[PDB]
Design a binder for this molecule. Structure first.
Ligand SMILES: Nc1ncnc2c1ncn2[C@@H]1O[C@H](CSCC[C@H](N)C(=O)O)[C@@H](O)[C@H]1O
Ligand SMILES: NCCc1ccc(O)c(O)c1
Ligand SMILES: [Cl-]
Ligand SMILES: [Mg+2]
Ligand SMILES: [Mg+2]
Lengths: 218, 222
């Protein structure tokens, strides 16, 4: 399998010749880097902005959130009446997320469901929000990816896009020595399941920690 | 340091095995292209599949292609289009496009593909001056690398606002990043278009580290 050698020189080049950065995004990345598999690279955040604008999304779902880099890139790409429903795992990094979203003037476009993502997603599938999302970004605990995926399939509209982060898990999914690891096994299972899942169109991208695109078929 | 997943043959084989939905038609075309002097110009199956996804994602009906070869990219595009969809495909070689037409017929999509045979410069000038101006949903640029700016500027007028422009080989085997590669026309042209895209406020941009570098440029609405 022929490929481009991802030397620091080539990765620095991709960054320098494609990343449109600003002080707000840069400052958030810097702050996040000083804290305890949730560091979104700027190339990924920019792709997220592109895909949102590409499908004419006004309503999106997020599972994970953390300091809110992926959420900020999403919201910035949305129209003035757009909304991100962000299912935030914990309140620990909420006050950081809130600061940058306010600073970038997107806080009015972001709604936080604070607490257990299984519970917010269960409420959402039984709510008026069912089948109304244009895009879903799954970036939470890896053991719950199947649950998040099945819930996202009911939450997104036909033709909607589901995005699954970390599907390569540092290459561990491909590593035969990594045996019995719950996160690796769950990601291996969802990856295998997606290949033969006729409900979606599929693309697994070798960007950041592996980024899977699953378009819900009409 | 920029952290990344090591692209070992094991990891690349995994991406292929766990995501590529293949068929005999696509497989046979890749096999027939591999037995030609310029086989390395073919897009890998993961790129073809992404092309199908993006076409379906934006609800595209009408697409532009510059650089057809044996037509793998064209076939993936046409297959993703609705029954009344159209690909306007530009290519210099009749020989390579005579191979392409066999697979397009076999996959029942030959009716969806229109070939402008000859120099793409003249084909795109004719298209910009015609009824086709601003009617394309997607443009795939994958021809001679020295003409990428010309192809890009023409694609910007040919695609509708919100339309997607896709530029292949923007990493050129890493040569664009290689300081020892000096005075090479293809490398210099790709370096120039890459630098130009970064500050081009007419588009939303994403440079993907897939295949030989794949640049996505969404024409903004205004
Ligand atoms: N000036 C020009 N006008 C039209 N086609 C050109 C051109 N210069 C090069 N080409 C074409 O660009 C192609 C490059 S390879 C294209 C690869 C193809 N899309 C795939 O999926 O395999 C060749 O077929 C070559 O004929
Ligand atoms: N691989 C170097 C040769 C090459 C030339 C033109 C292409 O479009 C292409 O994908 C590859
Ligand atoms: Cl816009
Ligand atoms: Mg993540
Ligand atoms: Mg190419």
């Amino acid at each position: 399998i022929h490929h481009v050698e991802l030397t620091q020189s080539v990765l620095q080049y991709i960054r320098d010749s494609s990343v449109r950065d600003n002080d707000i995004l840069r400052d958030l990345r810097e702050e996040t880097s000083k804290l305890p598999t949730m560091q979104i690279p700027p190339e990924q955040g920019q792709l997220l902005s592109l895909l949102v604008r590409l499908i004419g999304a006004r309503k999106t779902l997020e599972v994970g959130v953390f300091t809110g880099y992926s959420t900020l890139c999403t919201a910035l790409a949305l129209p003035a009446d757009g909304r991100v429903i962000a299912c935030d795992l914990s309140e620990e990094w909420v006050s950081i997320a809130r600061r940058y979203w306010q600073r970038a003037g997107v806080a009015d476009r972001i709604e936080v469901r604070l607490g257990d993502a299984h519970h917010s997603l269960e409420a959402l599938v039984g709510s008026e929000h069912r089948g109304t999302f244009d895009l879903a970004f799954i970036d939470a605990d890896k053991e719950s990816y199947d649950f998040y995926y099945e819930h996202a399939l009911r939450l997104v509209r036909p033709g909607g896009l589901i995005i699954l982060d970390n599907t390569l898990w540092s290459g561990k999914v491909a590593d035969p020595s990594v045996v019995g690891d719950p996160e690796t096994d769950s990601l291996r299972r969802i990856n295998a399941k997606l290949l033969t899942d006729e409900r979606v169109d599929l693309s697994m991208l070798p960007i950041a920690d592996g980024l899977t695109l699953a378009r819900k078929r009409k």
